[PDB]
Design a protein around this ligand. Structure first.
Ligand SMILES: Cc1cc2cn([C@H]3C[C@H](O)[C@@H](CO)O3)c(=O)nc2[nH]1
Ligand SMILES: Cc1cc2cn([C@H]3C[C@H](O)[C@@H](CO)O3)c(=O)nc2[nH]1
Lengths: 212, 217
């Protein structure tokens, strides 16, 4: 058996470049937090590993901090995947899959993970796949232009357009092309548009809009 | 449930310093191969990781290769722990527990893992404890004085090991003492201690297999 086979709520992964409006799109589901297990990317855990800020240390010295940073990131996504709930729906911001097919892969290309390290991570991903139950029912792709993504990131971190281009192509390879092992179906939103009002045609029966 | 809760054979962990005679001790169980799942240190996997040799690189440049080396070593020990068998006894050379409590701790103390890396590895060990079933019924501790183990390493000249200083052996000695004698680590099972300053070539030989030709007519 795999670990946490009992965690099987309908599990939606929100995927997107930096600055694809993931945070906005996710905030819209808050009204449903009583019926939906809502998990936003755990940046604050990356900023504070028993004292240490792995996020700064990585965007400062990526050659040194890549392996440890992606290692910890991978753990935190694995916790979100395996996190039990009595709710019928889980929506996660990103996934172990975006860690493996996008961030790790870009880090290998940019030379921040040598072949030694890369091979070790891939061996772990194969072990994780064999050993840990990861419910993935649906992916929502917030698909952007790198140009549009770069504008949004200005509003913060020192991130070049070229990094966003790199992450865009890997997202295109995974979610549009089918060049990675594909767990589930993908729905694409044009995240170039403003998504402030997405889904608002749907209203909760409990909303004051339906009071007498 | 945890992964591989089905792998439940009586599992014995052989632990000791570099040079404690673990390879000799394990080889004496070879006559029991039909009834024991015998799993020796997977050094060969560490010497070829889809082409790369991680052991060399770690003893060459520990500061760079410590995080990767110990992460992969951890994986290979997990593969032995979780390996299924129809035999009633599994005997493993070392464990994830020596990786965590001895080798990772020693690399942190020697500055080859910065706090960031150590903390990340600890979070994973805690997750592995929670997620993966690790059968541990017995530890046999091949206890040595560092000086006797130093001498044994010299007499072998095993290329990677040759240049290990006495001070490194002392460090790993004290980490084994803290775990297997002092109980300063979370202890899963009982420990039996051999005096591995002595030669163990002939240990257990009062016991002979009935199938042995010494009991042929
Ligand atoms: C799964 C995953 C999330 C993630 C985020 N990040 C960075 C990019 C953004 O600037 C920041 C907030 O998402 O974290 C990364 O470098 N690798 C990652 N992998
Ligand atoms: C679990 C574990 C085994 C192990 C072996 N080794 C080294 C010590 C010896 O020189 C060699 C074979 O025991 O491998 C290490 O550096 N870290 C390790 N961790």
């Amino acid at each position: 058996m795999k670990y946490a086979e009992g965690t099987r709520p309908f599990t939606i992964l929100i995927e997107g470049n930096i600055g694809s409006g993931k945070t906005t799109y996710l905030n819209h589901f808050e009204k449903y937090k009583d019926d939906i297990c809502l998990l936003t990317e755990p940046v604050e855990k990356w900023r504070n590993v028993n004292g240490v800020n792995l996020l700064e240390l990585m965007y400062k010295d990526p050659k040194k901090w890549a392996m440890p940073f992606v290692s910890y990131v991978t753990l935190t996504m694995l916790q979100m995947h395996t996190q039990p709930t009595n709710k019928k729906v889980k929506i996660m911001e990103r996934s172990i899959f975006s860690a493996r097919y996008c961030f790790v892969e870009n880090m290998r290309r940019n030379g921040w993970l040598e072949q030694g390290m890369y091979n070790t991570l891939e061996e772990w991903y194969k072990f994780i796949e064999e050993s840990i139950h990861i419910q993935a029912d649906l992916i929502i792709y917030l698909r952007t232009s790198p140009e549009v993504a770069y504008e949004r990131i200005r509003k913060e971190e020192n991130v070049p357009l070229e990094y966003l281009q790199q992450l865009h192509q890997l997202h295109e390879d995974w979610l549009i092309h089918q060049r990675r092992p594909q767990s589930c179906k993908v729905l694409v939103l044009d995240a170039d548009l403003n998504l402030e009002n997405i889904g608002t045609e749907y209203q909760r029966s409990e909303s004051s809009i339906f009071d007498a």
